[PDB]
Paper text:
Trio is a large and highly conserved metazoan signaling scaffold that contains two Dbl family guanine nucleotide exchange factor (GEF) modules, TrioN and TrioC, selective for Rac and RhoA GTPases, respectively. Dbl family GEF modules are composed of a Dbl homology (DH) domain that binds Rho GTPases followed by a regulatory pleckstrin homology (PH) domain. The N-terminal GEF module of Trio (TrioN) catalyzes nucleotide exchange on Rac subfamily members, whereas the C-terminal module (TrioC) catalyzes nucleotide exchange on RhoA subfamily members. We found that regions C-terminal to TrioN enhance its Rac1 GEF activity and thus could play a regulatory role.
We chose Trio1284-1959 for this analysis because its molecular weight (78 kDa) was potentially large enough to get a high resolution reconstruction and also because it was the most well-behaved and highest yielding Trio variant. Cryo-EM single particle analysis ultimately yielded a 2.9 Å map, which is unusually high resolution for what ended up being a ∼55 kDa structure (not considering regions that ended up disordered). The final model contains residues 1 to 177 of Rac1, and residues 1284 to 1594 of Trio. However, there was no obvious density for any domain or residues C terminal to the Trio PH domain. Comparison of the complex, which may be the first of a RhoGEF DH/PH module by single particle cryo-EM, with that of the TrioN–Rac1 crystal structure reveals few differences. More residues of the PH domain are ordered in the cryo-EM structure, and the domain is rotated about 4° with respect to the DH domain relative to that of the crystal structure. Density for the N-terminal helix of the cryo-EM DH domain extends outward by eight additional residues, and residues 26 to 31 in Switch 1 of Rac1 adopt a markedly different conformation. The linker region we showed to confer activation (residues 1719–1959) are likely disordered because they all exchange within 10 s after the start of the experiment. However, analysis of the Trio1284-1959–Rac1 complex using cryo-EM did not find evidence for any ordered portion of the 1719 to 1959 region that might facilitate complex formation. We created and purified deletion variants of each span (Trio1284-1959,Δ1772-1784 and Trio1284-1959,Δ1867-1873) and compared their GEF activity against those of TrioN and Trio1284-1959. Deletion of either conserved span led to reduction of Rac1 GEF activity to the same level as that of TrioN, indicating that both elements are essential for the increased catalytic proficiency of Trio1284–1959.
Numbering used by the authors:
A (entry chain B): 1 to 177
B (entry chain A): 1282 to 1497, 1503 to 1523, 1528 to 1594
Write the structure that this text describes.
Amino acid sequence: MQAIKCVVVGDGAVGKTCLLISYTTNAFPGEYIPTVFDNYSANVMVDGKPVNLGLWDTAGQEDYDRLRPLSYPQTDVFLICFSLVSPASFENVRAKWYPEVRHHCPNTPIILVGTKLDLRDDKDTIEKLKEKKLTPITYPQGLAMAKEIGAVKYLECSALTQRGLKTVFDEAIRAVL
Amino acid sequence: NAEEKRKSARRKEFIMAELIQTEKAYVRDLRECMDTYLWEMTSGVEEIPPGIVNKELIIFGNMQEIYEFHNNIFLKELEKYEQLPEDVGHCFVTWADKFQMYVTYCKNKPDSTQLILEHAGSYFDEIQQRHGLANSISSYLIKPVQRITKYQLLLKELLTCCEEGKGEIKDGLEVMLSVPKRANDAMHLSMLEGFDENIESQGELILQESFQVWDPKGRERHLFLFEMSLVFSKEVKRSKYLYKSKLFTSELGVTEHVEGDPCKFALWVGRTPTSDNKIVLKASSIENKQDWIKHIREVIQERT
């Protein structure tokens, strides 16, 4: 029963807490999105090889460059999460998170996740981004950045509809194996 | 605006309920960590590894102090204002200094963690296997660090939902933003190497940041602003700071506007701000520059 540790790192607006709540509870939070997600651990059966997967959420530690890397030692896999309706997080992926993660953990595998897939086709988000001369991040841009930072796999998920959310953690587990 | 009132009240009740029901879980996890891993080290029967004997204070820090603060005082106060979520920030003002213990805890985190991976071996893993616990030792140890950074988010959520009593929530939010800032400042200061003086002799740290400094080309100099000094230190390879120079704040003077770039500001010493002896520093943003200017001017005013 191998134990695997997965730490999620990203900006505040990426939505990592909801990303984990919707996966663990198998249901979108709904009216209230939780602010606190305690460390998770459960048995997951992947490819006939049961493992014990543990999930670490780093919410609230964005503006603290010394408190944040306290969770990095002894991490089996990282999830670098950005938002598809915010290019600022896409730039901070190569500006802030990847250098720190690769500095503290030179050999830990990384999965590049793009969240909020459901808002990409919205006609309100598109207009609001056009007001600021911004466009949503397409799939090829995410794939190119994943190849840039040497991430194992680029994936897109949606906490609202749970599309691709179950594949992210399965691929993260399979990366370690 | 019936919908506005409904949404505000419902979200406020949800936030207060989460604030109480996560504090309870935090206290429970602290008690379990104290009664499972620490107990074996102190009053156990197994063979402790030679390198971690009599060193439970290093490994667990002052977690017992944090537990006795939360288990005996803080939670009883948070439960009092369950029906008055607008005043919960007051609970963070009376015990403002009581959170200074957290500043200590983080400072011991690099010391403890390495020890577990240097001399503990498979001791705590075997303890977890025997006790059948889901969490490892590090999962329990990291919890105060996470918890100190969760109060600010809940206070921010409550800030946008309250119509009256915004001042109390704002004060609590300021306190619970100051505490992690001090925790990060202390961890940065703990790597200051070569300081040929007393740390406590300079007062308390106020700010720290990395700048580009033109010595009277741009060279990186991490600055530490104490109540009585400003320390310019180089950063060299790990992340350790080499003490390079210091400036007494009483003799210091500030030039806010420097032509050629909006992110540059000058510092000078002596009665007369003579040219060619001006320390030019380039901030990373306008907000950082303004905050540094304000704090340095406050320090100078305090010293006079």
